[PDB]
Amino acid sequence: SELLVNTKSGKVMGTRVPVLSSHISAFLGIPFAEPPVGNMRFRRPEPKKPWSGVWNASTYPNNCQQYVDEQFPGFSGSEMWNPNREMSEDCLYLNIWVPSPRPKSTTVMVWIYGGGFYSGSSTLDVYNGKYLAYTEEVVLVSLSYRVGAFGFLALHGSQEAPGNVGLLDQRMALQWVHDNIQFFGGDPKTVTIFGESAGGASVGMHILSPGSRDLFRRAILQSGSPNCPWASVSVAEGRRRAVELGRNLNCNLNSDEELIHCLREKKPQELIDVEWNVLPFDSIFRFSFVPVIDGEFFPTSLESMLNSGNFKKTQILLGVNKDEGSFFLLYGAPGFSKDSESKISREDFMSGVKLSVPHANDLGLDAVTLQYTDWMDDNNGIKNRDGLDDIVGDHNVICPLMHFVNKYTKFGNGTYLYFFNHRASNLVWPEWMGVIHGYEIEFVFGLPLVKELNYTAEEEALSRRIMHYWATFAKTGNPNEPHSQESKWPLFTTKEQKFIDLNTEPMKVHQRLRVQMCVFWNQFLPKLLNAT
Amino acid sequence: SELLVNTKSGKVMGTRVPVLSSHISAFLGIPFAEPPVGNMRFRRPEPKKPWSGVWNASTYPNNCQQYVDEQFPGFSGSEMWNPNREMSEDCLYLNIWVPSPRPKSTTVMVWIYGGGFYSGSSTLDVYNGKYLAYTEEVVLVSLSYRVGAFGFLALHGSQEAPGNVGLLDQRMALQWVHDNIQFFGGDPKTVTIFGESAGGASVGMHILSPGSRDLFRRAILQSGSPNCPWASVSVAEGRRRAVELGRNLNCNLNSDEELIHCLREKKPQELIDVEWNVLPFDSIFRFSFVPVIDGEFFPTSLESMLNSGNFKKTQILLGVNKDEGSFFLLYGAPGFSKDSESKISREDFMSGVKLSVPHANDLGLDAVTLQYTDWMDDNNGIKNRDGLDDIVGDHNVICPLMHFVNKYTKFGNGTYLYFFNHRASNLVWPEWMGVIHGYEIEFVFGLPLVKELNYTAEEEALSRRIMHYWATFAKTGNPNEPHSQESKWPLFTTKEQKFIDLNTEPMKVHQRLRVQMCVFWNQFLPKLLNAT
Ligand SMILES: CCC1=C[C@@H]2Cc3c(c(N)c4ccc(Cl)cc4[n+]3C)[C@H](C1)C2
Ligand SMILES: CCC1=C[C@@H]2Cc3c(c(N)c4ccc(Cl)cc4[n+]3C)[C@H](C1)C2
Ligand SMILES: *[C@@H]1O[C@H](CO)[C@@H](O)[C@H](O)[C@H]1NC(C)=O
Ligand SMILES: *[C@@H]1O[C@H](CO)[C@@H](O)[C@H](O)[C@H]1NC(C)=O
Ligand SMILES: *[C@@H]1O[C@H](CO)[C@@H](O)[C@H](O)[C@H]1NC(C)=O
Ligand SMILES: *[C@@H]1O[C@H](CO)[C@@H](O)[C@H](O)[C@H]1NC(C)=O
Ligand SMILES: *[C@@H]1O[C@H](CO)[C@@H](O)[C@H](O)[C@H]1NC(C)=O
Ligand SMILES: *[C@@H]1O[C@H](CO)[C@@H](O)[C@H](O)[C@H]1NC(C)=O
Ligand SMILES: [Cl-]
Ligand SMILES: [Cl-]
Ligand SMILES: [Cl-]
Ligand SMILES: [Cl-]
């Protein structure tokens, strides 16, 4: 009854789950698309055909096929991001947590996982929607979408592998929420999409894309934005990477149809095993199969859409973490280690700059180096390490997001900007990595509220604060409760450019988030690279 | 007897001058060249023909023909630099201060005045040699040389106006000292040349030029070095400026001979009146007629000579002032005034940047701006003012000199580097100008020892310290007296790059003078400008 819901495509039976000292309803693994398998690999998704009988929605679904990280086998800090369910191309499912008793018509929040467009799962422990749904009385949906070549192989002009199909997977889940969430007590007119990393970029892409704009009300972007340098490629570059994927697999390259036919015969792990081989440069924070600027999902270049105001005009809430780069340096740059302070030699610093800005000419590399080197103390291994950390984070996350923030706010209806700089007391990664990419997620999803996870009481309060900001913004377009006496998170405005720190200390308002480095990344360096 | 000296060119009769509570001998206005007048304008100097009788050397000579500054008529702070004697092309004379009684064979210091190669006089009150000669028991010579077009008109290929003849004037005075100073009690094997601004560049140029190297022992450079962007031009640019000088005066431009003949028939003031018209750009800290890289006085490019060690290997002592740029901004940049704090708007800041780096493309201007702009506070008029001050001083004086210092020290026999940052208690210029270009000269020449000038006791102590460093270096190649208990001024080395502050406080040693900005000026910006 409470667990038995009739949707437009058939009946679903959820399950009653414990949350803290209470319970809520969970509907796990509801299908929203036809399985994109066989001849449907690389194709746009098709709506799930209606079923008879009762869909058993008591169990998490499979995860999409993806690279699995084996750098630190058994280490919780890396394993927590890997698929925790069987991988399958049959992976287009969504999950819903519903407060008990079922509300009449409440705010909906739809989580879009990140992972560089090459990885990610809706089913990770850290994306468990039950604490947020319970604590804030929202209906929490987590969707899924194809990643890697399966979601983003792009042979523009082919209707068999057009590109962006992972984004269309997301849109079809949004369409399903629009059509069905009312049966779960959600208001389809008050849907907030939120996501981190590639999920944050995705959220921004749905803001931009005309075919997505009417399927949600407002948006939250965490450590990602649509204009990030890793988040899209041109149709020519997508085509080059798809041809090179076939070349790595001894495919007939004479035509799109012959190439696609070859790739559809391969087993999924055969594609994944060569996925990284198509990148044009030795690099970090670059991923092979990503959204393509196609003229269809994206009518024009992202920058022109941003400049002209060709995007959904609504409220947004978004921000970044203090040390976005450390994860990527640990995994891809010389001199970094999980088990040392990772003091970086001058030689390894220069190597890291080249890996971090792979598209830069020698003059551009000199500019980055000069901008981040203290020439009174150039052999300081801590300064070299932290300088590289800032380079990676500023170039790939912080400054792209600030460009988006500044462009969006000219036309939008409300911007709230945050800077998350709390390092968790129980973090398993070493201190040099600081406030790591993605480690705000556990606070957004309320994991500090769980006694057995050993967060401090101050971190529980911060998580409660963040969840309330997020859900109140989702409900009202404003993270602040009116007539409350706590300090107010101010609108980011073009003139004053205010943001807040998110940490365990009382809220502080600042202005011009990393403005000095972002003038370098957003204006001077692009002009230098264009001119040379 | 003491005042009657027979030189190789004839007899001279000096005068006995009071100095503090004692007396010394002065030989003023001794000719060292034939008057460069008539058909000898623009020509290399010729040695002064010997004279019969006794040359009356009791009176300062004429000053060379030059632009006279009328910006602040009657204001001591600017008038103190203007000619204080009649101007004439008949101006190639030198002055000698000799301790009394005459020493047997003592250290010689030869002062070379600055003034952008367009101005300067040996007779300024601030260059009065009597305090240094008396206090430190040296023979103090001040030479003169043709400035402006008269000294540096350059039509390469012509023997009538070859260029660099002002440097040859200096050389001929050095040759005269070599041949004659023994008759005044000076040791021709222990001559130190020292100079400020264009005089400091000149000193470095004699270090470089093979024809000058054997005419002095060691060298002091104050706020000037031979590689300064204002201190030389190419043969092509020198020719262009000479032809443009003729165009401004309705001259026949068909040939060097006709152009030169036209220019030789003009009154001196006619040349001076159009001197600034030949500069290629609106600019500050740029001067029309300067040394030319000719292949003779300078066998190859200054940079190749520095790189190869093609220069005199000896000891050098050199340094800069804290606020080298303020004089040039006051006189040439919008928003600066003698009678106000000169807070600079963003608009006037950008205007000043273009005036300060006139040769830079737009990308180069952006680089300079970004490097000197605090984008958290870009409308701060004080920061904008001081940022421009730093731009002018760093680009034109400090970083060229640090490049010279580093190249020289690889081959030289001892480098001593200073940073003069004491603002005189009795300065007549406003406080925003700080420690002005040229305002260390009055300390080098011992003016604070004159009670009537109202320096503090601490400034008298600083002047005496500086005079003793300069003269002890002149005598020994080391500003420090061994066996002494004074703090020691350390050698500048390639590895440690130490320098001292010169001020009224106890000595501080620092390393890497303005290294961050000078990497920008000496490595990055030239590379940006060469790419584009
Ligand atoms: C690569 C993109 C990516 C983004 C998200 C965040 C993320 C992921 C990881 N596997 C990580 C593995 C090690 C470390 Cl220290 C951080 C990670 N983090 C922060 C996945 C993959 C999800
Ligand atoms: C322009 C070159 C130049 C360098 C020397 C120092 C100098 C000179 C001036 N006329 C100055 C006029 C005003 C001020 Cl505030 C400073 C000046 N200072 C510092 C002459 C001319 C000699
Ligand atoms: C749904 O699946 C779970 C486990 O897969 C099972 O325990 C439950 O009984 C199922 N519901 C049915 C079969 O109605
Ligand atoms: C949002 O839009 C409404 C309706 O036009 C307007 O009244 C309000 O001022 C806007 N708020 C912001 C922050 O732009
Ligand atoms: C959390 O703390 C409890 C109680 O002190 C301890 O038993 C447990 O091992 C801790 N959990 C983790 C994951 O460290
Ligand atoms: C030399 O000139 C000075 C200054 O005018 C004068 O006092 C002196 O009498 C002159 N000497 C002779 C011998 O004329
Ligand atoms: C200067 O040269 C002398 C003689 O060759 C040498 O002994 C001395 O080490 C040199 N000093 C410096 C500071 O280079
Ligand atoms: C020096 O200071 C005294 C006392 O302040 C003053 O009388 C005198 O005029 C000053 N000298 C000059 C040259 O200004
Ligand atoms: Cl079924
Ligand atoms: Cl850190
Ligand atoms: Cl605004
Ligand atoms: Cl100042």
Sketch out chain A's domains with CATH numbers. 1-532 (3.40.50.1820)
Answer for the pair B88, B65: CB distance below 8 angstroms, yes or no: yes
Answer yes or no: do A375 and B519 touch at CB < 8 A.
Answer: yes
Number of neighbouring beta carbons within 10 Å of residue B284: 21
Answer yes or no: do B527 and A366 touch at CB < 8 A.
Answer: yes
- The tokens describing A29, both together, are 């693994």
- The tokens describing B55, both together, are 């040359």
CA distance A86 to A329: 29
Give all strands (DSSP E) within B130-268, no chain letters: 139-142, 186-196, 218-222, 233-234
Name the DSSP letter for residue A16.
Answer: E
Give all strands (DSSP E) within B3-46, no chain letters: 4-7, 10-13, 15-19, 22-31
- Quote the radius of gyration of chain A (alpha carbons, Å): 22
Ligand positioned closest to the Cα atom of A454:
5
Answer yes or no: do B524 and A370 touch at CB < 8 A.
Answer: yes
Answer yes or no: do A524 and B370 touch at CB < 8 A.
Answer: yes
Cis before residue A482, ω within 30 degrees of 0? no
Q: Residue A496's closest chain B neighbor by CA? A: B376
Indicate the residue of B376, B512, B531 with minimum beta-carbon distance to A376: B512
B367 lies within 8 A of chain A by CB: yes
CA distance B454 to B447: 10
Answer for the pair A333, A355: CB distance below 8 angstroms, yes or no: yes
Hey, whose CA ends up nearest to atom 3 of ligand 1? A115
Answer for the pair B167, B297: CB distance below 8 angstroms, yes or no: yes
CA distance A420 to A414: 20
Answer for the pair A45, A51: CB distance below 8 angstroms, yes or no: no
Answer for the pair A350, A356: CB distance below 8 angstroms, yes or no: no
Answer yes or no: do B366 and A527 touch at CB < 8 A.
Answer: yes
Chain A (498-527) residues lying within 8 Å, Cβ to Cβ, of chain B: 511-512, 515-516, 519-520, 523-524, 527
Q: What is the 3-state secondary structure (H, E, C) of A355-402?
A: HHCCCCCHHHHHHHHHHHCCCCCCCCHHHHHHHHHHHHHHHHHHHHHH
Q: Is B56 in the pocket of ligand 6 (CB under 6 A)?
A: yes
- Residue of B100, B142, B144, B197 with catalytic role: B197
The region, left, alpha or beta by phi > 0 then psi within -120 to 50, assigned to residue A414 is left
Sign, Cα dihedral of A121, A126, A129, A133: negative
Q: Is B195 in the pocket of ligand 2 (CB under 6 A)?
A: no
CA distance B161 to A335: 61
- The tokens describing A111, both together, are 């989580």
- The tokens describing A493, both together, are 């405005």
**Packing angle, helices A362-372 and A346-356, rounded to 10:** 120
Phi first, then psi: give them for residue A355, nearest 5 degrees: -65, -35
Name the DSSP letter for residue B417.
Answer: E
Residues near A450 by beta carbon (within 8 Å), at least 6 away in sequence: A20, A131
CA distance B439 to A227: 53
CA distance A80 to A94: 20
Nearest to B36 by CA among B123, B118, B115, B151: B151
If one residue of A4, A28, A58 were mutated to test the ligand 3 pocket, choosing by the most ligand atoms within 8 A of its CB, it would be: A58
- How buried is residue A283: exposed, middle or buried, by Cβ count under 10 Å (0-12/13-18/19+)? middle
Name the DSSP letter for residue A69.
Answer: -
> How many CA within 13 A on the CB side of residue A163?
28
Residues near B27 by beta carbon (within 8 Å), at least 6 away in sequence: B3, B5, B12, B14, B15, B57, B95, B96, B97, B98, B184
Please tell me the distance between residue B454's alpha carbon and the centre of ligand 8 in angstroms: 6
Answer for the pair B315, B413: CB distance below 8 angstroms, yes or no: yes
On chain A, the residues whose CB falls within 8 A of the CB of B524 are 366-367, 370
Answer yes or no: do A366 and B520 touch at CB < 8 A.
Answer: no
Nearest to A208 by CA among A158, A166, A171: A171
Cis before residue A101, ω within 30 degrees of 0? yes
Nearest to A318 by CA among A228, A427, A210: A228
Whether A257 is catalytic: no
Element (H, E) at B420: strand B415-420
Element (H, E) at A103: none
- How far CA B507 is from CA of A83, A296, A351, B263, B465, in Å, comes to 65, 70, 41, 53, 11
Number of neighbouring beta carbons within 10 Å of residue A265: 11
- Rounded to 5 degrees, what angle do the CA atoms B53, B59, B64 make? 105
Residue tagged 């004086």 (tokens): B397
- The tokens describing A62, both together, are 């499979």
- The tokens describing B34, both together, are 């034939």
CA distance B81 to B95: 18
Answer for the pair B140, B97: CB distance below 8 angstroms, yes or no: yes
CA distance A518 to B370: 11
Nearest to B142 by CA among B103, B108, B106: B108
Element (H, E) at A95: strand A93-98
Residues near A52 by beta carbon (within 8 Å), at least 6 away in sequence: A10
- The tokens describing B445, both together, are 């020449």
CA distance B179 to B188: 8
- The tokens describing B85, both together, are 């004697």
Whether A197 is catalytic: yes
Helix and strand counts by DSSP (H, E) for chain B: 19, 16
CA distance B206 to A304: 59
Torsion, Cα A277 A279 A281 A286, to 10 degrees, reads: -120
Sign, Cα dihedral of B177, B181, B182, B188: negative
In three-state secondary structure terms, B235 is: helix
Q: Is B504 in the pocket of ligand 6 (CB under 6 A)?
A: no
CA distance A199 to A222: 8
- The tokens describing A81, both together, are 């991001």
Residues near B56 by beta carbon (within 8 Å), at least 6 away in sequence: B13
Number of neighbouring beta carbons within 10 Å of residue A116: 23
Nearest to B331 by CA among B393, B368, B285, B399: B285
- The tokens describing B137, both together, are 């028991």
Please tell me the distance between residue B15's alpha carbon and the centre of ligand 6 in angstroms: 9
Amino acid letter, residue B24? I
Answer for the pair A307, A419: CB distance below 8 angstroms, yes or no: no
- The tokens describing B328, both together, are 């040039």
CA A251 to chain centre: 32
Answer for the pair A434, A389: CB distance below 8 angstroms, yes or no: yes
**Packing angle, helices A256-265 and A235-248, rounded to 10:** 50
Answer for the pair B479, B444: CB distance below 8 angstroms, yes or no: no
**Packing angle, helices B362-372 and B381-393, rounded to 10:** 120
Give all strands (DSSP E) within B77-199, no chain letters: 93-98, 106-112, 139-142, 186-196
Nearest to B164 by CA among B176, B178, B143, B147: B147
Q: Is A350 in the pocket of ligand 4 (CB under 6 A)?
A: no
CA distance A516 to A468: 32
- Bridge partners of B316? B219, B415
Method underlying the structure: X-ray
Q: What is the largest CA-CA distance in chain B?
A: 73
Whether B395 is catalytic: no
Answer for the pair A68, A83: CB distance below 8 angstroms, yes or no: yes
Give the ligand 4 atom nearest the CA of A414. 13
Answer for the pair B288, B278: CB distance below 8 angstroms, yes or no: yes
CA distance A60 to A409: 38
Answer for the pair A88, A63: CB distance below 8 angstroms, yes or no: yes
Residue tagged 């679904």 (tokens): A61
Amino acid letter, residue B198? A
Q: Residue A521's closest chain B neighbor by CA? A: B370
Question: For the sheet containing B4-7, what is the strand order?
Answer: B4-7, B10-13, B54-56
In three-state secondary structure terms, B499 is: strand
Answer for the pair B54, B11: CB distance below 8 angstroms, yes or no: yes
Residue tagged 């981190």 (tokens): A196
CA distance B313 to B310: 9
- The tokens describing A456, both together, are 């401090």
